[PDB]
Amino acid sequence: IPRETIPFLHLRKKTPAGDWKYDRQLSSLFLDGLEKAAFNGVTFKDKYV
Amino acid sequence: PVMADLNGGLQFVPELKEFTAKLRKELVETSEVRKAVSIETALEHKVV
């Protein structure tokens, strides 16, 4: 993820002002979990949906 | 189209919900304890 650069799939985080700004760390563990979910795949065992 | 924030700044006081819910939860304590303490002392004054 380049600095000052927003990736395409980012999570967000409310700021005490009230809006939602792109957070980088909180959008990091989402996005690598994806990349993990893309090499090994993700399991949903015991989910109930 | 215009927005016109006639809000006094209540978007700045953070976590207003319980900040609100606390201000009144205290106003019932300070109200009811001076309801209960007042009546029993007046009741104390009726047995001595």
For the largest interface, the chains and their residue counts are: A-B, 3 and 3 residues
The percent range for helix content of chain A is 10-25%
Strand order of the largest sheet of chain A: 1-2
What percent of residues of chain A are in strands? 5-15%
Shape of chain A: flat
Structural class of chain A: alpha+beta
How many DSSP E strands of chain A?
A: 2
| Quaternary structure type | part of a larger assembly
The N- to C-terminal Cα distance of chain A equals 32 Å
Radius of gyration of chain A (CA) equals: 14 Å
Give the biggest beta sheet of chain A.
2 strands, antiparallel
- Quickly count the helices of chain A: 1
The SSE string of chain A, one letter per element, is EEH
Family (chain B): Belongs to the thiolase-like superfamily. Fungal fatty acid synthetase subunit alpha family.
Protein name (chain B): Fatty acid synthase subunit alpha
PDB class: transferase
Keywords: Fungal Fatty acid synthase, transferase
